[PDB]
């Protein structure tokens, strides 16, 4: 159903709509990518990420 | 006639030879004397447990009724004289009690037992089977026999030890059975009674309490038990959380009281620190310290891990008692029981004393009040939970609340099997 309604705006985390158009952001400890529609970590152990070291 | 409502000197009193030796308030409905004859037993109970402890293996469970073992030898104190009695007086600490008591004592001990009999059976079950045994030939006193009836329960039962000894032995046993309605049996072993066994002491008890607060079987499962021999074990481990009275003494041993129905009879357990060896506790055990363990108890929300267990004990009390100072009572050459006979020629003594105790402990218990609570059931736990996982060497105590009598004493060493 339009913008964020459809597949959560091809983002990786949060969806909004500043200026009648899709926009993405990210949880603290993350940094949106240059492509703008994906969240690239900022450190090793970031929130929501099951610790998996093997 | 019923003793539980019949003061002494209402029956032939003041017997032969009565011994004499060269601020703590009395509880509710209680007789100054009972509470006395009672605290005496306490004094006696620790010493005895200790000795009886060395007699066995730190790995064998222990169980018994000091009060019984105590009351029985009180039917001897009754008809004893000279140097023999004195002993029976200082080994069962009956020398602390006042005049009157230290005489009619045999009576009170009864008036005591009754009290401890009701409250117990009222909600739970306590069976006892105890009698004195002597050979025919010997002509036992008429009086003592009358006393012994309306005080210890029954008269003395003459048997043909000399004639068909064993025929008589296995005759006693059966008697115990037809009294303890099965539960206790073989009170007396084989090679205990021969053609010389003139007099033997026989007291035996069975007990299975009722938890004030049950234990769900559904919360019972096989877990480990870390024996004192180092070994491992798998026993039925019960479990329940609730508010109980409890105390962790400075030393660290853990004192837990679990009441039976009606809070008239509780069974405190003594679980030492893992650093501590249940033995050291036993080596260091005093009446004074039995006090500390209880004197200060608080009601908390503690989780209890307790095993389900059974314990049947049969043993000759003579062995021990002797070492404790009672000598004459068992030596023909030098006795002094002219109260039960007085005719032979110093030919009356005690060959042995057989005490057989048996304890049962399953999850059972109940009050079942109701589903008396229908409110928001927060899903958090009691911030101040305390745990008592007696999955290792722990003592047992069964007492009366007001009077504070130590009905049963005992130890849980090997539960599993």
């Amino acid at each position: 159903r339009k913008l964020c309604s459809l597949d959560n705006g091809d983002c990786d985390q949060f969806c909004h709509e500043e200026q009648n158009s899709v926009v993405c952001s990210c949880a603290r400890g993350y940094t949106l990518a240059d492509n703008g529609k994906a969240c690239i970590p900022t450190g090793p152990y970031p929130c929501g990420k099951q610790t998996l070291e093997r | 006639v019923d003793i539980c409502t019949a003061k002494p000197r209402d029956i032939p009193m003041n017997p032969m030879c009565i011994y004499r030796s060269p601020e703590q308030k009395i509880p509710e409905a209680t007789n100054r004397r009972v509470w006395e004859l009672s605290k005496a037993n306490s004094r006696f109970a620790t010493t005895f447990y200790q000795h009886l402890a060395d007699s066995k293996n730190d790995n064998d469970n222990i169980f018994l009724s000091p009060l019984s073992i105590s009351t029985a030898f009180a039917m001897t104190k009754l008809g004893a004289c000279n140097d023999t009695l004195q002993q029976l007086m200082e080994v069962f600490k009956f020398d602390t009690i006042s005049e009157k008591t230290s005489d009619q004592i045999h009576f009170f001990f009864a008036k005591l037992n009754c009290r401890l009999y009701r409250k117990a059976n009222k909600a739970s079950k306590l069976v006892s089977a105890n009698r004195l045994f002597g050979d025919k030939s010997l002509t036992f006193n008429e009086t003592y026999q009358d006393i012994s009836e309306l005080v210890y329960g029954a008269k003395l039962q003459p048997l043909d030890f000399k004639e068909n000894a064993e025929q008589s032995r296995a005759a006693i046993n059966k008697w115990v059975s037809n009294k303890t309605e099965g539960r206790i049996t073989d009170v007396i072993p084989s090679e205990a009674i021969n053609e010389l066994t003139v007099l033997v002491l026989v007291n035996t008890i069975y007990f299975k309490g009722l938890w004030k607060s049950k234990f769900s079987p559904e919360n019972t499962r096989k877990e480990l038990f870390y024996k004192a021999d180092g070994e491992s074990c798998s026993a039925s481990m019960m479990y329940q959380e609730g508010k109980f009275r409890y105390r962790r003494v400075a030393e660290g041993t853990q004192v837990l009281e679990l009441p039976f129905k009606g809070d008239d009879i509780t069974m405190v357990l003594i679980l030492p620190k893992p650093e501590k060896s249940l033995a050291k506790v036993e080596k260091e055990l005093t009446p004074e310290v039995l006090q500390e363990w209880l004197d200060e108890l608080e009601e908390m929300m503690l989780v209890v891990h307790m095993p389900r267990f059974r314990i049947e004990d049969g043993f000759s009390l003579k062995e021990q008692l002797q070492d404790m100072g009672l000598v004459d009572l068992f030596s023909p050459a030098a006795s002094a029981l002219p109260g039960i006979v007085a005719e032979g020629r110093d030919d009356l003594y005690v060959s042995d004393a057989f005490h057989k105790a048996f304890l049962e402990v399953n999850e059972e218990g109940s009050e079942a009040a109701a589903s008396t609570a229908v409110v928001i059931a927060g899903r958090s736990l009691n911030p101040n939970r305390v745990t008592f996982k007696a999955n290792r060497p722990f003592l047992v105590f069964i007492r009366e609340v007001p009077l504070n009598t130590i009905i049963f004493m005992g130890r849980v060493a090997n539960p599993c099997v």
């Binding site: 985390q13 949060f14 990420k49 610790t51 | 919360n219 928001i376 927060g378 911030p383």
Partner: protein
Amino acid sequence: IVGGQECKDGECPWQALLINEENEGFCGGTILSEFYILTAAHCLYQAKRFKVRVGDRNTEQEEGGEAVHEVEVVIKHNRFTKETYDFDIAVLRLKTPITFRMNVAPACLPERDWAESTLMTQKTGIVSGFGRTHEKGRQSTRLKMLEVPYVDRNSCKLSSSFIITQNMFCAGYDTKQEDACQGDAGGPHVTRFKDTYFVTGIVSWGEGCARKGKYGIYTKVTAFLKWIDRSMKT
């Protein structure tokens, strides 16, 4: 927990654990970050002296990896009541920051709006803790986790004996009998989106544990992200 399973190494790193001076757990936490822990309000009510242990999956046997932090600042939502269990939440600031490692990492905090539209609409979430395992059974030795279908608010209410604040929310299986239980309060209820988990609600109360037609009540985080990070600034 009642049913569910056992968090295999690193499946619920955010789970935290409040314990007492006698050392005993009794309220789940939710690592929000290196300093703040997210727990229930009723958890601290009649409490007295405790601490937070992180990344520990077994209580009967301590084997490093586990850490014990102290509480510098406790903050219960001032408007909480044991008579409505509304506003059952609180934030915990520790004295010395956590050191992230296996079994230890936070869970993310959604953004109100997005949250209410993307996690809350989702089918399930994962509560976890060391609660019991039957209404009045034994405590868990290990850290169980269990999935839980979100429940229709309007239905939650018809099943509930006690009112349901818009601060609360339900999670349970209509007929299957599994749920959160005593010892679990304050624990996390995280909902996944893509490869990330966000905390959505806090383990609050419920009637019994897994009763017929009864649901799991959780503090709707999504309706406190404000009071939260506000608290997260003392």
